[model samples]
Target: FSVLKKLGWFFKAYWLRYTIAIVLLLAVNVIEMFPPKLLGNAIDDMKAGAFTAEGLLFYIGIFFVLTAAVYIMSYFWMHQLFGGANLMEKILRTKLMGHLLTMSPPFYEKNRTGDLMARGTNDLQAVSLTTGFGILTLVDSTMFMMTIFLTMGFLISWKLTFAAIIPLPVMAIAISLYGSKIHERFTEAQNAFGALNDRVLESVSGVRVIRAYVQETNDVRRFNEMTADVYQKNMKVAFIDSLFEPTVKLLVGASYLIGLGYGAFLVFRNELTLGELVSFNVYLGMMIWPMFAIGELINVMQRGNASLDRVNETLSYETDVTDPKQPADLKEPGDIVFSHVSFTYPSSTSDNLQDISFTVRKGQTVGIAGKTGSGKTTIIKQLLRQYPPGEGSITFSGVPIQQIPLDRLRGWIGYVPQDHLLFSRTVKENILYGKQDATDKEVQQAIAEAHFEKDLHMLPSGLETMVVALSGGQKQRISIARALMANPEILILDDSLSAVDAKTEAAIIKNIRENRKGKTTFILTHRLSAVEHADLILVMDGGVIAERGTHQELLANNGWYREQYERQ
Candidate 1:
């Protein structure tokens, strides 16, 4: 019930269709009542003696018409109802995907990929079923059961009606108890599934590492343990879910006993005819589905209840960053400056970048050189504005970076991190991401400096081959092409060429210099030759700029940069 309340917005949005579906179902249920009456009436006419075939023909034909009508109505009601469920699934999936994209990296660090996948897939499916089958059972069972019982009481003896329902109260209490167990067990089962999802995902992604460490046997054993754990959890859920129908059958059986036994007595007392008693019995048989529906309703409700909670909880997480209502009037970043900027990572006491100040005027290149963890990569944290924008202000042109709209600011910069992020798509599509509207002319032209253009002919599908089918070097080459192809105002390459040879590295550097003469670039690399033409070079150490000068000036200073370059 609480779960339904949580999803009330979705329900309310489609209220018109649900209403029509329920009314159509009600009409079908009403039409269904007549068939049993028709059956008993035919029984009466036959027993009294049928004089002609026409009378029997008319009755049989009428029953067929009602059956046909119900079938048509059933089709429509099911379409309207289940369509709502289908839309909910699509909408929820879209919403979840969009929300994940909006979430910062810290959100992912806390909530793992496999767990999020489970929530998006299995849990979402459970919640989806609740609206379709769950609502269907709720409306059909409760309403049709009431209509049948009322028809039975009106048509048959009140005494028989009172007698038949004696065991129902007991069944109700038992079902509610079953409902509790279903909720508890299903929750555990869902949780175990998420855990199992994580274990499999972790093991699969690190297959090479596991083989290198000679832990194949251990991983297999661990995987088997998790599977067994998941099995036990599901078995517990199955135990209770299985009890629903059997419990319903036994209870309905008891009611059948009282109904038939007492209904026959009513006929003997002249309160009912034999045909009428038979009709009452037929109506009571119709009660079976509604009773079972109630059982399944409880089943779906508990599962949906737990699943919706998980999905809703995930949706509730608010990202800390947002674009201001009125951004700067500037169309793009120019003359970037970081004046006394300092940043400490989330949940950290020490600053990763402290008092880091630099300037890169329009069309000038600034090269950053530092050892790993020496704060070279941390500059991108502020430059990218991945975190909240309040630690210290990094200005773009004259305006603070925080004042720029997120889309414009992000679109203006081109960045290729150490490890590239590529989705499951054709290689052409992955490269197309940098500039969605880029033509084939630009794509083939951009790779003019490379083995990629030469290797293109050897690829199975050429540029359109799936990125996953590519080797390690191919991924880097293709991914780097995306970042470079955009011809962005500012490009940040954070050691993007570590996978390639020195010759390929020089060609890439040469391409950038030739192809992008007027654009600003930030190159962070161990190769000092890459920065020789830079307007100003930055050498980072101990969270501050230990050395800053031209390539020649750094050589003149004979500091860490001069020594490191010479040593290399």
Candidate 2:
């Protein structure tokens, strides 16, 4: 019931549908009680020798009518109620994906891929069952039990009815303890399943590495241990679930024996009629399902409660970066400036970049050189707004970067990272991902500009070739071509040319300098020759700009950059 209260926002929208379904469910339960009464009357009439052919026909006709009515009502209610449950499943999945799309990198760092997948698939299914079967059992068990109890007590012997229900309290206590254990065990089982999913994903993604390193046996052994853990956790949950039914039936059997034994004594003492005693037994039998339904209600709702809590915790995280209420107008790219910018990662104790200050004028080609872990990638991450700077500011033209709309700012820039991620699609499809509506001629020009024309000719299917069979250098070239298809106002190459040979890198750089004359470009490379002709070259050391000048100027100064250039 508390879990239902948490989901009220979605449930309130379809109140009318639930209201109609509940009314129909009540009608079915009420109609179900009449058959037992009619049967008892027929038995009593037969014993008194008053049962006639007309009476038999009348009872038969009445039973048929009640049966048809119950069937039609049950059908409609099942459709309406279950239909709402399906709709909720869709809405919840969409909401979770939508929230994920808006989150920053920090959010992903905190949550695991397998855990998130479990929330989307397994947890959502449990919640759907809660909304459908949970509500049905809640209404059926209570309403039907009350109807049976009233008819038995008022119309039959009240003393006999009291004796029959004395065992019900014991059944309730046993089921409550079972429900508590089920909730705890089910939560553990779901977590183990998520861990198993993560292991499988990693194993599949790294299959080549596993075989190359000759660690296949070790990997298989680890997988078996994870699966064994998952099985053990689920067994605990199954053990608790197994107790529910037999415990319910045992108490129900006790009630039946009490009713029959006491009912015979009353009839012999002439305190109750035979027909009334028969009707009372029939009413007691009807109580069995209500008892069973109560046990099921607790089981279903407890599972639902555990899953709903997992999903709610995920949705409650607020993204660190947010859009402004009134953003500044930004129609095109301009000069990029970083004024005394410093940044530290969310989980770090010290700054990654300290007092970094620089500017790249419009249409200029700027290059950055650094050793490994010297904060080269961190510079690009700040410009991409992956994380907010710890201090100082960054701006485009004269407007603060924070004031620009995120979509507009990102749309003007084309970025390629060190690890080239090419989808397992055809070459043409991968290139078209940069700009969905680019023409064929534009595609050819981008391929030529990236110096990938020779490789394309050697490929089996040319532009139609699937990327899965491509080499590392070929994939890198395709990534560059994809970024070039955008014809972006600013192009960023973040060590993207590392795979290709030096000759191809020189050819691609020449093409870029000639064709993209008026647009800004930033290249981060370890190769000194790549930045030899740049208007400005920055040599980074230990999170600071150790040197800044043209390549020839750094050579003339004879600093760390000049020594490194001569050695290479």
Candidate 3:
């Protein structure tokens, strides 16, 4: 039932096109079947010495007209079918991407990047092939077969017609027995290919580490083994796929030869006319493809089913996080309150945050400091509802965070991740990614607030500088400016200022506090100086709030906060 539901989704919007294409396909096949019959009549006429120039010319003219109809109808079917294929691919990709984005970080932790890429590219292409060319072959084959069977029923003995089609059941049994095996082999091959791709991606992304350790040869050997496994599996599937056509062709051939030989004998006995015998031969030739259509359809269905399963696997992931059924609208002047909040990631055995409690007024600059895994970033992740908290709850502007629409929840916060990614575009374009409608004045203000103006000025084209040539600090600064461009209600800087000099970090924090009004800010950093003047400074140790107070109070206490500060 799950498989059927997924297959149904692939063809959901294509019913109208399927209907129109099928009708056109039938018209084209029926017209094409006429040609063989007309030619057969011409042949019998020639044998009897009763053929005339005008009659043959008339036959030629009819064939031309049928040929033109076939061409035009073929165009319609191609247009309708191929257009549906492109639309299906787009819809499937968009839906799959949306589902993937909604999943928590842990989902990505368990899944490989290469496998996701395979679902998007190779698997999608396979579905397109089955939906497009497969449909065409199917409709044509069915219509052609029906026409031949009808001809055999009225124009020839029913008993002989049954004898001719007797091998069809044998073909059906062969397809049923081997189709699943072929699908299984193709799926295994694709899995091996995805594993190979993962190795390649991992090696390329960490090329510096590989070179530093002189581990290139070892990586190459592992990758080669993966590639060989993929190759062997692919060839095995190909060999199975190759058998479908010829085996079916042999069965079809036996049927055609039986009709031809028997029909000719009947004609010689005066039980049938020369014209009827000719018609029988024509039907036999035309039935060749329609008879083999069963094999082609099964082959397509098997491949499509396998690809659909791969696509569905990604789409079927269960995410604990979700927006409320009825969401409340929110705006700036955002106040955040975390009450007895505890959160462990989906895959983590230990809590990243344990019974954390804090509150920030509408407009305040707050800082969080901790060791590497002390849950600083996890607090921000939960505040934004990136995933459901394992225990307790948090609120934004007095409304529970879970009650906000996902887009609205995300839109209200400006976040700069630890390692910000820069697109391969100009600096101006990357900044625009933050706020598509930001004015030049707003952009310049963000740059100045993040102390990025100096870096921008050093570039050849200020804001228009190309990103491909930028350094790590420059990229981080650009992302910071971009994150600020949105003028978010709550801005969370998750260790984004680590690359900047200490002096610049202080200056930027000062600028943010001075320039931004009615905007709550959360800074997650390891630097003590960064949190010195914060209204609320949280020092976390091992997922618990070791201390929480104004910086001066923490300094006076001389607790874990003071010891960590002195160490730094």
Off by over 4 Å in 1: 49-54, 169-250, 454-458, 556-558, 561-568
Q: What TM-scores do the predictions have? A: 0.86, 0.86, 0.79
Can you tell me which runs of candidate 2 are displaced by over 4 Å? 176-249, 270-278, 424-426, 457-472, 561-568
List of clashing residue pairs for candidate 1: none
Q: 342-421 in candidate 3: lDDT tens per residue?
A: 88787677666688888888888898887887778888877776666566668776788777777877787898888677
Assess the local accuracy of residue 254 in candidate 3 as a C-alpha lDDT between 0 and 100. 83
Tens digits of per-residue lDDT for model 1, 119-193: 999988998899899988888678988988898888766778778977776787687788788989999999999
Candidate order by lDDT, highest to lowest?
Answer: 2, 1, 3
Candidate 1, residue 288: the lDDT equals 60
- Work out how many backbone clashes candidate 3 has: 0
The per-prediction tally of clashing pairs is: 0, 0, 0
| CA shift of 230, model 3, Å | 10
| C-alpha lDDT score of every prediction, in listed order | 0.82, 0.85, 0.78
Error of 1 at 518 (Å): 1.5
Candidate 3 global lDDT? 0.78
Q: Write model 2 residue lDDT over 133-233, tens digit each, in one string.
A: 89988997889889888888887878999998998878988878887789899999999999999999999898999999999999999999999999999
lDDT of 1 at 235: 96
lDDT of the structure predicted as candidate 2? 0.85
